[PDB]
Design an enzyme around this catalytic site. Structure first.
Site, PDB file in Angstrom:
ATOM      1  N   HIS A 153      48.037  38.574  30.666  1.00 56.42           N
ATOM      2  CA  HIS A 153      47.705  38.943  29.296  1.00 56.42           C
ATOM      3  C   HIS A 153      46.645  40.036  29.219  1.00 56.42           C
ATOM      4  O   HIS A 153      46.225  40.391  28.112  1.00 56.42           O
ATOM      5  CB  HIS A 153      47.282  37.697  28.497  1.00 56.42           C
ATOM      6  CG  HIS A 153      45.904  37.186  28.802  1.00 56.42           C
ATOM      7  ND1 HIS A 153      44.826  38.031  28.952  1.00 56.42           N
ATOM      8  CD2 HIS A 153      45.435  35.936  29.032  1.00 56.42           C
ATOM      9  CE1 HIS A 153      43.748  37.321  29.232  1.00 56.42           C
ATOM     10  NE2 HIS A 153      44.090  36.047  29.286  1.00 56.42           N
TER      11      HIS A 153
ATOM     12  N   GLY B  78      36.304  36.183  27.629  1.00 55.23           N
ATOM     13  CA  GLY B  78      36.168  36.953  28.844  1.00 55.23           C
ATOM     14  C   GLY B  78      36.161  36.140  30.118  1.00 55.23           C
ATOM     15  O   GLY B  78      36.048  36.722  31.203  1.00 55.23           O
TER      16      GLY B  78
ATOM     17  N   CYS C 249      38.692  34.525  31.250  1.00 56.44           N
ATOM     18  CA  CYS C 249      40.027  34.511  31.829  1.00 56.44           C
ATOM     19  C   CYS C 249      40.012  35.184  33.195  1.00 56.44           C
ATOM     20  O   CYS C 249      39.339  36.197  33.401  1.00 56.44           O
ATOM     21  CB  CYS C 249      41.013  35.211  30.894  1.00 56.44           C
ATOM     22  SG  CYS C 249      41.318  34.307  29.356  1.00 56.44           S
TER      23      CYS C 249
HETATM   24 AU    AU Z   1      39.565  35.644  28.436  1.00 57.48          AU
END
Ligand code: AU
Ligand code: AU
Lengths: 301, 301
Positions: free
Chosen positions: A41, A143, A145
């Site tokens: 993503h 952030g 991820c």
């Molecule tokens: Au993230």
């Protein structure tokens, strides 16, 4: 003596954490050998998350669109592909701090240590468990991820998790290092709900075995029970049904304490039927189920 | 979102962990620059711990009696001295993995991350707090002496603790990195008892502020209180008396939540007077006091 929620030393994983920036979004990547693994993503914005044809958006992306950063060093991407829900960014320079590692998909109930990262920099480390509904109760801000969950066997770092999503119910979901999500969750912002979070019963008994060898013995009691009948009480309080395998894994815990596995199930059975009367076990006022039987023998080794 | 017990990334400290063997005993040492820091009871056996004139036993020890090991590498000791309850083993080769560090003596109530080590090898990492009776509720087996507690500020690793003793009551005691014990505990096997373990009240309010921004708001209630009167209820339940400084540190937590510090004290006051009715806050059935106000703003940053 003493018992605490312990996580693996994250030093070997900190040397594998990089920053991945694709367009306007930024997150963390796992730099192993000459490959950087990150959630797919990264190639999406806030509007794409509503519904993203990931194959279509990857058509417009090239090698120079992925910015891999390792501190004050920029990595050169010379290849990229999509494996399920992860991104495989091939780079030209191998990671010198690559440890011994494998890609292992853990089972529901197993534990692992998570390193929270932001902008490719480690922020903290905490112990986590794969809940039976295939979610985790971790700490993940924006952030985060790309943060990974890992286990360490002597020299082998067993990578098992990568954060992807935060469900609207507060918990989190992610994939293994091969891109396959844990459970029926997709990398898309929709109305996703996890099942009824049951309790890992084998992890509760192992935790109760740790309380015995540490002083907390007020829950020890003069009753026994059978596996089928304990599962009746366990099923009522939303507990995982106990199998013969779970009984065997607690064998070492039962052999040293001299308390049979069925005798521990009866003491637990009374804790579910009578509560805790305001008392605590190992400093907790509830029954902790985030300790595998191997987590106990390792802390009591 | 999400909130968990998080410890600092222990990678910078793992590169400072060595093994110290003096005669028959073995434990861990902190290798910074060309100095190795370890508890001074390494020069003692099991019989000396009954009552050890440490100055006398150090007279018989020389440089070659201290075996410093860093994996498959042996360090050469060319100097040794005793600073309070720590041992300063000067070596000939400086540690290449020495990070930015200082020696800071923390206050009662402050938190720090501990790296459990055995035979100079890291075993796990967990978050700990300096209890008001100057003990800690850590996980320390035999051979864990020499393990350190640390904080990390961007690049500065703030060393603050070193494990030494396990009291007969189950808790642990140690010194700073200068050798001075935290509290009235000595490195001798005797009948040592810590005071009544009160609860860090400022750390409870900061934890309740973390529950507000995460969903858990059932404990929010329509009452307020004063500082003097809340301290009356706090003193009854063995809580730390709240000062004007503790109110100021929660300022940022109160400013973002729009809940006054006195309004949080009243909600807490009802939790002490009414219990929790079997409910949980942030996944805990008791009030957690091992989160400083800075630990919350860092996790909610
Ligand atoms: Au993230
Ligand atoms: Au020790």
């Amino acid at each position: 003596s003493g018992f605490r929620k312990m996580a693996f030393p994250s030093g070997k994983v900190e040397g594998c954490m990089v920053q991945v920036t694709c367009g306007t979004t930024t997150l963390n990547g796992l730099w192993l050998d000459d490959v950087v693994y990150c959630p797919r993503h990264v190639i999406c914005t806030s509007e794409d998350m509503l519904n993203p044809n990931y194959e279509d958006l990857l058509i417009r992306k090239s090698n120079h669109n992925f910015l891999v950063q390792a501190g004050n060093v920029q990595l050169r991407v010379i290849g990229h592909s999509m494996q399920n829900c992860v991104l495989k960014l091939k780079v030209d320079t191998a990671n010198p701090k690559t440890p011994k590692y494998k890609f292992v998909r853990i089972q529901p109930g197993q534990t692992f240590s998570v390193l929270a990262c932001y902008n490719g920099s480690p922020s903290g480390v905490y112990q986590c468990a794969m809940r039976p509904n295939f979610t985790i109760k971790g700490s993940f801000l924006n952030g985060s991820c790309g943060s990974v969950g890992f286990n360490i066997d002597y020299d082998c770092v067993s990578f098992c998790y990568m954060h992807h999503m935060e469900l609207p119910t507060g918990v989190h979901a992610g994939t293994d290092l091969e891109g396959n999500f844990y459970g029926p969750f997709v990398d898309r912002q929709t109305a996703q709900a996890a099942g009824t979070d049951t309790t890992i019963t084998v992890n509760v008994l192992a935790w109760l075995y740790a309380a015995v060898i540490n002083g907390d013995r007020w829950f020890l009691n003069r009753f026994t029970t059978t596996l089928n009948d304990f599962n009746l009480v366990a099923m009522k309080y939303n507990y995982e049904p106990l199998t013969q395998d779970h009984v065997d894994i607690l064998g070492p815990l039962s052999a040293q304490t001299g308390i049979a596995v069925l005798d521990m199930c009866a003491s637990l059975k009374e804790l579910l039927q009578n509560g805790m009367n305001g008392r605590t076990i190992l400093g907790s006022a509830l029954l902790e189920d985030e300790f595998t039987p191997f987590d106990v023998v390792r802390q009591c080794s």
